[model samples]
Target: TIKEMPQPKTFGELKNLPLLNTDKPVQALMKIADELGEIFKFEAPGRVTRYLSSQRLIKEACDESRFDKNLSQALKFVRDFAGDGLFTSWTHEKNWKKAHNILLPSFSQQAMKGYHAMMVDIAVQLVQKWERLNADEHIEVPEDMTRLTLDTIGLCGFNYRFNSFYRDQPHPFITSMVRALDEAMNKLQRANPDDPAYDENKRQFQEDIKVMNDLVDKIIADRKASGEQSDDLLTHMLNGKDPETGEPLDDENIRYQIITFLIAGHETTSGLLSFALYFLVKNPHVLQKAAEEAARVLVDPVPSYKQVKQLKYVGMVLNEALRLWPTAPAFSLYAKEDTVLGGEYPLEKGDELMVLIPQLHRDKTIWGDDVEEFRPERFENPSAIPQHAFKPFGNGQRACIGQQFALHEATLVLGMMLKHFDFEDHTNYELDIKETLTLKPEGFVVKAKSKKIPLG
Candidate 1:
């Protein structure tokens, strides 16, 4: 059954495309998916954006021969801060390949073990903070998780400490980076250049960029001056040479790489932690089961490297949370050549595609009517999940490089938090996702009472 992909052609149809004013673009996209079924396309002047909301359509789009990862306008806007870094680089860019090969080994299970002590260190700081909090105080889960993951990434990525926990506010770098990132998204909306506020916004962006770069530069300089050798990412960027070319990363590229890791590494993982906690607090049975597993596995004050991996139930909970609310929600792609996808919908070269993971995960055909439920049991057997059905990280070569790094950090933190504290959703808050570059529960608050498990 060959047919043109469904698209909005009339004024009435345009309303369904999510092109209107809405703070929650993901929810709007989901609404379109509900109205338009699996696939839809939008043609506007010189640009064409396509959305695929089903596993079958997305599976076909994933074929490298026919499609390639394409940088969306938002990602290109990110290059102002990230440059030709791994996450923002174009498919044809050489640096992604070079950095990918050089850094691949660093995120390995063996390499991750080296970062466990640092991961535990940051997690412990968070636990201490929670322990000190008044029993009645409502914990801002997302904000606290951000501090934890940022500190963890700072330590593991470069042996540097943001000391986020000790700070009265977020590090200056985090503040400027967040402002700059939010500004990037604002620009994507085609902000009016004629507006009196435009130039001020631009100037502010430059100032924020300087704040981020100044600190990253200092980190690089400190590593060089200390002459202390370490296995962290900073050391790799400084010393490791590309395998094929045998050429070391240039200083400028290395700076971008460090900034990219700092931006990508922490934000997604923090959002993941926040969502997982929200799910755990909302579902009592799942919470009890996960906490019990954490109790059995995390027998020590600091979880051992072996113990972190043994938190299988914690892993399952994280997986389920990702299935529901993927932090890095959507990945963009482009047609490599004129082709027919799923043997029906036709594509022309250069047509842009976005795989909306949220909608795909909720597809009733694949996950059944209970797809909306927070059931970690679905992930109990990894083999049971359908192929190409779950991709919270992304797809193809452009997939997130720090996946194992994220999983290791998140699993360890979740396990420790559960084992040490019993959580309560004091506000009975409904989930409201906040979106910047990633998705997190907005205004989600919880209470963490100390379990006071005796330290070994």
Candidate 2:
């Protein structure tokens, strides 16, 4: 295994203030990557975090034989709320494979068709909320987008309804989930375990986790009690057998998977739509082009599943938006064995590596000179792009299982919004990101004028 193995540059002192500034690691890491070049290491108290910023280094890290997904503290904190759900589960956990395979058919092309009506039901609610507002009044993009997404997943994943648009404050489930995610992020970034304040947050974190669990338990209980017959995700999980093992998911496992879907299904799509909206208002030409595509594809009041697929340009805009600001910005991987990364850097077993996705997406070698520009044309020929260069969803087998579900829901909603509203950025606000477990535009506001006034 001997070769010309060089070492990666290091960032800070042995105990350098947690390496990640708790508030905004997305921007902070980009600057660090620029200074340290392709591969660099930052030494925290007990660990060394190696970052891979360029395409070549990341490509090497993608070798499944050498590297596998690492459940870092970032995701470990999520365990309080999500348990050993698919996203936070261990790399080799048997439940991950079983749940993933059993749920595979739920997100298939056929499954998307079945879910289309429910998706539209929520989309219309969002449109109605926007239509009631005055043209000059600002719509809080992330807030409403979250409501739309949460409600959509609630209706489509299970037979439950959030009725999110009907309330001034979010439902208790939404409230608890957000609080839990915020506490998780704050614990990593700022809190010291010894602090009394940390104890308070920890208490609340457990309470919030209880709140979510109770709600999910109630939902499952009601479904079981009704003895209802439906084809939603809950029924499938309750009744469907693992193809390999021929065993149905246990009640507790079913509960975990539901929470996983609710979390995985909505949060990133909410951010995706929020970022895409900001980009559209900031770049008018792209807005016009996307609106035209929407006009053609969304001719009916409610777009058919076939029509949603036809909004190709809108899909490209989402791709470009994700390239600029992937909602789930970074993912961690570890060396499965002794390995050499990027042709020269020697890495030992279990060395944690973070793939800094925002920087990877902007690599000049892969994306070219207009890399900084908000250009959807770059994705017109998706096949030309090199592998591992653009990873909005994480890499390989452990990538977001709901990729199709997220894309279809996002395309349909974004396309409909563009078709009906002419969005304007009255504030001239520069981009500022709100980082939690996902990334979204913070304090970004826009005014919308409905092109077709009569709400369907």
Candidate 3:
């Protein structure tokens, strides 16, 4: 049981509390976790004020099929409100489940036999690109990897070729989509401080949103008009109906869902794989452990999904990387009502709650003395830890729906990259994370070369 502290009265006071000192490099993150755990158990308004509350009731409503028919309608409504609104759709439990059940299952070992073949095609293309480039040239690996993941998602998830990686010309839709998200994040930060520019910033955000919405709408219309029903996530989403309600997902709903998967599923995994590679390059011992695990489990050229699971140390290293630098740094929710939890304080409605996962994951009490160290073995016996203490992917029912998908993607990409390439940092630099909806590496650069192994 964690110890409790006296309640904080205002948001300002909450900010001044020990838990919010993550900006300080020396502070132990576990101190914040202990405080947060106590705050959650005590039902303190601190949880709500910090935007750390979980919408357990809302998720429960979603699960009980109470929101089935209205799910698409809600998505449509929100999408209409925010224009393309990819982020909201991705977070919507009903829609995530719909896409996951349809698309994710297709990537199962038996089904992904075809997908893995396609992955090899893309990987070979990447290898060729690296070979063509000058030997001494350093490239932005993140940008290249983003293209690779986007291409993978396009072919595997949509049976479409975006050619985002190879194409010399920039797609306007891609440019606009990225710009809109960046603008939206800036607006969110302004709104948080109740700044005077908040409203104007939001207006600009909506304008960008309109561009994205129009583009997605056009794509959806063209696909349907062409009468091309392929086995991609887009087609599945386009044709999917709620199993219980038997209501078809409309064009707007489908567009939002597809874009959501493309952005959420692709962007973060790209970030993680790039960062993981950077870390592996810097720490050869960790890389060797990961490679040893991969060599033991993945004897085949293309690893089977079952084999991916048995790469235990690889999973641990990935988990540790996620812990050290979670792509999604925090999770937030709005309180629904006044409630007494853990027999302590009262949590009022309209309060925003957030959990800074990096702080929690690096907590000393939970993780031991080497909390700040990049030790993956800490996760070897995960059961010894308390619940909700190590939530890189948020806790409880509102946890990320694509958690498994992200893990699988990371494993495949990291495993493959580690096996075939030796990463070198062109500039001996450290990471400066750009904290937004996801933690992103700012000014990331790396050099890649083929492993000294024969390729079949």
The top-ranked prediction according to lDDT is: 1
Model 1 C-alpha lDDT per residue in residues 228-306, reported as the tens digit of each score? 8885888988999999888888878888988888888666789999999999999999999999999898877789999
Deviating ranges (above 4 Å) for candidate 1 = 8-20, 194-196
The sequence of per-residue lDDT tens digits that candidate 2 reaches over residues 1-456 is: 434322333446645455575578778888877776787766676777787789988988888889999998988988777887788888798887888788889988779998899999999989988988965788988889988898888888888898888988878987898898888777786646777866787788889889999999989999999999775889888888888877788878788888888887566789999989888998999999999999877878778999999999999999999999998889999999998776677889988999999999989999998888999999999889888888888988888878888898999999889888988898997888877778888888888988974545
**lDDT preference between candidates 1 and 2, better one:** 1
**TM-score (all chains, Cα) for each model:** 0.96, 0.95, 0.75
CA lDDT of 377 in candidate 2? Answer: 90
In Å, residue 6's CA in model 1 sits off its true spot by 2.2
Error of 2 at 314 (Å): 0.3
Ranking of models by lDDT: 1, 2, 3
Q: Give the TM-score comparing model 1 with the true structure, all chains together.
A: 0.96
- In order, candidate lDDTs are 0.86, 0.84, 0.59
Q: After superposition, how far is residue 380 of candidate 1 from its true place, in Å?
A: 1.8
Which prediction has the highest TM-score against the true structure? 1
The alpha-carbon lDDT assigned to residue 271 of candidate 3 equals 76
Summarize candidate 3's per-residue lDDT along 35-118 as a digit string, tens digits: 544233212223323322222222322231221212121234334434333345434556545544544445454555455655
